[PDB]
Amino acid sequence: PLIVPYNLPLPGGVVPRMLITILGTVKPNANRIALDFQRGNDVAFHFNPRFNENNRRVIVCNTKLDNNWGREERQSVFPFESGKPFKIQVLVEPDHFKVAVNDAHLLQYNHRVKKLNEISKLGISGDIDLTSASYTMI
Numbered sequence: 179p180l181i182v183p184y185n186l187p188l189p190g191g192v193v194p195r196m197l198i199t200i201l202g203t204v205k206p207n208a209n210r211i212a213l214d215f216q217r218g219n220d221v222a223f224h225f226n227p228r229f230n231e232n233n234r235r236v237i238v239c240n241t242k243l244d245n246n247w248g249r250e251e252r253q254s255v256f257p258f259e260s261g262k263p264f265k266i267q268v269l270v271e272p273d274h275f276k277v278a279v280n281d282a283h284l285l286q287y288n289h290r291v292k293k294l295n296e297i298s299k300l301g302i303s304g305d306i307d308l309t310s311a312s313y314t315m316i
């Protein structure tokens with residue numbers, strides 16, 4: 179496995195047709211997972227499954243610019259389960275990140291950060307055993 183938090187370099191940032199795949203297993207009694215696609219200190223795309231926010235499971239997505247969080251986009255469809263292996267695929271499309279979990283479409287997140295080729299790191303954190311993190315051009 180990989181050590182969490184884990185940093186995956188994205189050389190020359192991202193670009194449409196780039197597919198990023200994260201394989202892991204959620205720990206028992208998990209509280210959170212986070213993917214942070216960063217442009218330097220900014221977070222272009224924060225993808226944050228929360229297992230207990232007011233006794234609901236929710237996915238919170240956002241962007242952080244100059245250390246300020248923007249408007250959250252929330253998704254109540256929640257495909258993760260404590261204890262279970264997962265696959266998160268993030269496909270960069272021209273206008274949005276497209277996220278599928280376990281081969282089922284989950285959400286899209288429109289690009290707020292425009293300099294895609296400067297989004298050069300993915301941080302992976304939270305209550306998971308991380309198996310692999312990689313990318314491919316499709």
Ligand SMILES: OC[C@H]1O[C@@H](O[C@H]2[C@H](O)[C@@H](O)[C@H](O)O[C@@H]2CO)[C@H](O)[C@@H](O)[C@H]1O
Binds near residue numbers: 224238239250
């Ligand atoms: O927006 C993503 C960001 O959220 C922070 O938590 C928010 C919270 O979601 C919101 O309901 C409350 O009113 O303000 C909190 C602080 O901005 C998280 O702390 C952060 O890690 C991100 O997940």
